[PDB]
Every structure is written in structure tokens, then in C-alpha cells.
Amino acid sequence: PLEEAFDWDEYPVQRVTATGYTAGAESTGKNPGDPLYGLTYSGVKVKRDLYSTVAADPSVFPIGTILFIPNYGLGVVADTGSAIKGNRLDLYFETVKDVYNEWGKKTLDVYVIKKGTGKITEDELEKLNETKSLQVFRNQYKTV
Amino acid sequence: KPLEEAFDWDEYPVQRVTATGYTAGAESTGKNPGDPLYGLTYSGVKVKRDLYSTVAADPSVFPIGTILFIPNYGLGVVADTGSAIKGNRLDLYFETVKDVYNEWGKKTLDVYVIKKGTGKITEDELEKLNETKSLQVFRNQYKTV
Ligand SMILES: CC(=O)N[C@H]1[C@@H]2OC[C@@H](O2)[C@@H](O[C@@H]2O[C@H](CO)[C@@H](O)[C@H](O)[C@H]2NC(C)=O)[C@@H]1O
Ligand SMILES: CC(=O)N[C@H]1[C@@H]2OC[C@@H](O2)[C@@H](O[C@@H]2O[C@H](CO)[C@@H](O)[C@H](O)[C@H]2NC(C)=O)[C@@H]1O
């Protein structure tokens, strides 16, 4: 594939943190019908292609900057965002499902603690969450 | 210390799986808020993010009620299922779509800077890049035919 087709290490390298996004309201607060729906900060339409539109911090990667992003592809800096600051990228995908599956999808090892019986109730789930020996870890997962 | 290193988890059996995130929202479930069935899992339990969170899996692999420890997510109780959740597949519940984007989808990686931009980009410039002759062989893997 493209990752192996060229010696990319001849180009400058930048460590970044990257998430995915779509043109939809969950990312942009805009919906179909809005005048600027689907349009990046630069004015060009969002695109997932050989060269895809990506979001970055203009002070780090100016608009028009061409990047190669492993496991995503070639990217042209065309968009920006309030949360997109510093060494941060946001990668355009067509659908929320694509963000979940093409960037969010992770292969990893999980530990099987107890085989289930086929049932679970609210009471049992509450009992598990009230486990005394684990309350010290609980604030790390509770939102409230 | 983090839960991920507070116990010798390798004492327990290990299962390689492919995992994604989901929410109660319509993008995942097709249900809208106001629906009395909104946020209701297959097991009849309400979706929950907590010490023990509700996760989705294939019952034939992980029966309902199965407790897992998923690194960088937490302890999970299999309480949900899904048409696409088959085989060694897990779907991890998050409260919002942004949480799925940020808390699961966020990756630290190196990218290569091919060319620094001038501060402007046009549709025609982007089109010409995508029409690069020597790269049309690679284009099938990114374009959605
Ligand atoms: C919270 C946050 O930073 N959201 C970003 C996320 O990353 C890129 C994209 O989605 C971004 O949306 C773009 O915001 C810019 C600044 O308000 C707008 O000028 C762009 O038109 C908008 N892009 C699109 C495709 O709508 C969000 O602001
Ligand atoms: C595409 C797909 O499989 N989506 C899944 C995704 O993973 C778990 C959850 O979201 C799942 O939603 C649950 O579907 C089950 C039937 O398949 C229903 O019985 C559950 O009530 C439903 N869960 C919720 C919280 O609505 C989606 O079907």
C-alpha cells in the first residue's frame, strides 16, 4: 500500500494527536440546508479521497499544507476548529459510522473476568458499581 | 495508580478483540431521545458509563452478564448486542459522540510534512492533486466508489 510505496522518512516528521470528524452537526453544529454545510474553513468542500481535507492549527500547519497520515492517507490542510490547537489534527470522514469504524476501531487484548449467565439486572449492575474495594478507582470513570 | 496497573490482569484469560465505541443516540441505535426505549440495552438494562460500564458483544462469545476488563476503557459488563457486533467484536458505550471521538478515537502518531501551505487552497488545486497520474493506482483505497 501507500505506507510502504515510498520512503516517507525523507520528509520532515511531526508528532500529533489525531481524531476524526464529519461535516455533520455533531462536529460542526451545522446541518444539510445551511449555507456553509460541508464547507471547510478554507472554503473548499470536505473530501475523502486520495487527497482528503483535514483540520489543523494554521500556526502549526498553514492552510494548503500537504501531509501524509499513516492509516488515513494523504491530507491537505483545509479546515480549522476551536479545539484544533497545537500539534493536533482532525481527519475528515464521510459518516459518523466511518469515524467509529475506520479510525476508532482498535484491535486489543481484553481480560475475561467472569462468564455471564445470560442475564443482567439494574440491581446487579448497581451492586457491581458499589464494590467497596474499587470505589477508590470509581472517580476515574464517573462523569459526574 | 491507574486500574490498568493496579492488579495482575494477566492472571485472567485474555481474548483479542476489535473494539469501537457507541452511544444511545440515533447514529448507533436508530433511536431518538423521547423514545421510551431510548438508552435501553438488549438485556433490559439502561446504558451506563461508570466503574462497571455497559458494553455490547456477541452473546455466543461473551454471554450477557460477562465481566471484562478493557484497557483504557475500564471494567465492562456485557449487557447489549448488535447486528454488526459478531465474532470477537466489542462495542463500548460512551455518553456522547464526542466522547467516542476523543476518549477512544484519539491517537498519538507521527505524520509526514510533504509541503507547507501558503495559507490558501482552492477546489481546482485539490482536484489536480487527486488527479495525480502516478498515484491513481492508490486512489481506489481512499475514494468511495
Ligand atoms: C470542537 C471542534 O474543534 N470542532 C471542529 C471539528 O474539527 C474540524 C471541524 O469539526 C470543525 O468545523 C469547522 O469549523 C470551522 C470554524 O468554526 C468552520 O469555519 C468550518 O466551516 C467547519 N467545517 C465544516 C466542514 O463545517 C469544528 O469546529
Ligand atoms: C450497527 C450496530 O450493530 N449498531 C449497534 C451498536 O452497538 C451496540 C448498540 O449500538 C446497538 O443498539 C442495540 O441494538 C439491539 C439490537 O441489535 C437492541 O436490542 C438494543 O436495545 C440497542 N441498544 C440501545 C441502547 O438502544 C446497535 O444495534
Author numbering:
A (entry chain B): 73 to 216
B (entry chain A): 72 to 216
Article sentences:
However, a dormant state in Firmicutes can be recapitulated in the laboratory. This paper describes the first structure of a group of peptidoglycan cleaving enzymes from Firmicutes, called stationary phase survival proteins (Sps), that are involved in survival in the stationary phase and are analogous to the resuscitation promoting factors (Rpfs) from Actinobacteria. In this paper we present three high-resolution crystal structures of YuiC, an Sps protein from B. subtilis. The overall fold of each domain of the symmetric dimer consists of a mixed direction six stranded double psi beta barrel surround by five helices. In all the structures, the final two helices and the last strand of the beta barrel of each half are supplied by the other chain in the dimer.
Incubation of YuiC with 5 mM penta-NAG in the crystallisation results in two linked sugars in the final structure per chain. One of the sugars is a NAG that occupies the same −2 site as the sugar in the crystals grown in the presence of NAG monomer. The second sugar has clearly formed a 1,6-anhydro reaction product. The anhydro sugar lies at the −1 position and the unmodified NAG lies at the −2 position in the disaccharide reaction product. NAM can easily be accommodated at the −1 position as the O3 of the sugar, which has the lactic acid group in NAM and then the peptide in peptidoglycan, is pointing into the solvent. The carbonyl oxygen of the acetyl group of the −1 sugar in the YuiC + anhydro product interacts with two main chain NH groups (S154 and A155), which are conserved in MltA (G300 and A301), although the carbonyl also interacts with the side chain OH of S154 in YuiC, which is an extra interaction compared to MltA. The main chain carboxyl of S99 is hydrogen bonding to the N of the N-acetyl group of the −1 anhydrosugar with the side chain of E98 pointing away towards the side chain of T94. However in YuiC the −1 sugar N-acetyl group oxygen of the anhydro product is interacting with S154 and is on the same face as the O6 oxygen would be. Careful inspection of the −3 site indicate some waters are in positions likely to be where hydroxyls of the sugar would be positioned, but if it is present the sugar is either much more mobile or much less occupied due to cleavage at a mixture of positions in the penta-NAG. It is more likely that multiple cleavage events before crystals formed have led to a predominant two sugar anhydro product and this form bound to the dimer may have been preferentially selected by the lattice. We have also trapped an 1,6-anhydrosugar product in the active site, showing that formation of a 1,6-anhydrosaccharide is the product of the reaction.
